[PDB]
Copies of this chain bind each other. A is one copy, B any other.
C-alpha cells in the first residue's frame, strides 16, 4: 500500500512564531511540545522545528523510536489530529483561517514533496512499506517456533529411543 518514513516521523505545522527586529522568526524549543506529547502517551524521542534563513519555519518534525512501539505511537499521533479535525486534509482546505497545531505522520507524499519538509525527511530517513515490514516480522517468528518445535521434536525422539531399549 502506502509507504512511510523510516524511522517513523511526525510532521506538525502551524507553530506560532514571533518576528524579531532583524526580521527573523523564533519560537518555542519544542521540548515543550515533546513533553505534551509524552504526557499524551505519544512517547516521542525528539521534537525539532525546521529552520531556514528566516529561522523558525513554523513547522516541526516529531521523531519516534525505530521499533514497532514507535510506529504505534506515531499512528496514534496521526489518528488523534485526524479525528480532532486537524489532519493534513484539514490543513489544506482553502476553506479559511486555521487555529492551533495541525499534524500528521510522514508518508511518501511528504518525503517526495519539493519543500523544507521533504528535504528534511530525505536528509534523515527512507521510505518503507508497512506490509513488507509487517510480513518479515511474522515470518521471523513463524520461523523460530519451528526451530523450537524442532528441538522438542528431537527430545521426543530421544525419549522413544530409551523406551525402545527399555
Contacts and interface: CB of A to CB of B under 8 A. Distances in A.
A32 interface: no
27 contacts: A1-B166, A68-B158, A68-B159, A68-B162, A72-B162, A72-B165, A75-B162, A75-B165, A75-B166, A79-B165, A130-B162, A130-B163, A134-B159, A134-B162, A137-B155, A138-B155, A138-B156, A138-B159, A141-B152, A141-B156, A142-B152, A144-B148, A144-B152, A145-B148, A145-B149, A145-B152, A148-B148
Contacts of A137: 155, 159
Contacts of A152: 141-142, 144-145
Contacts of A71: 162
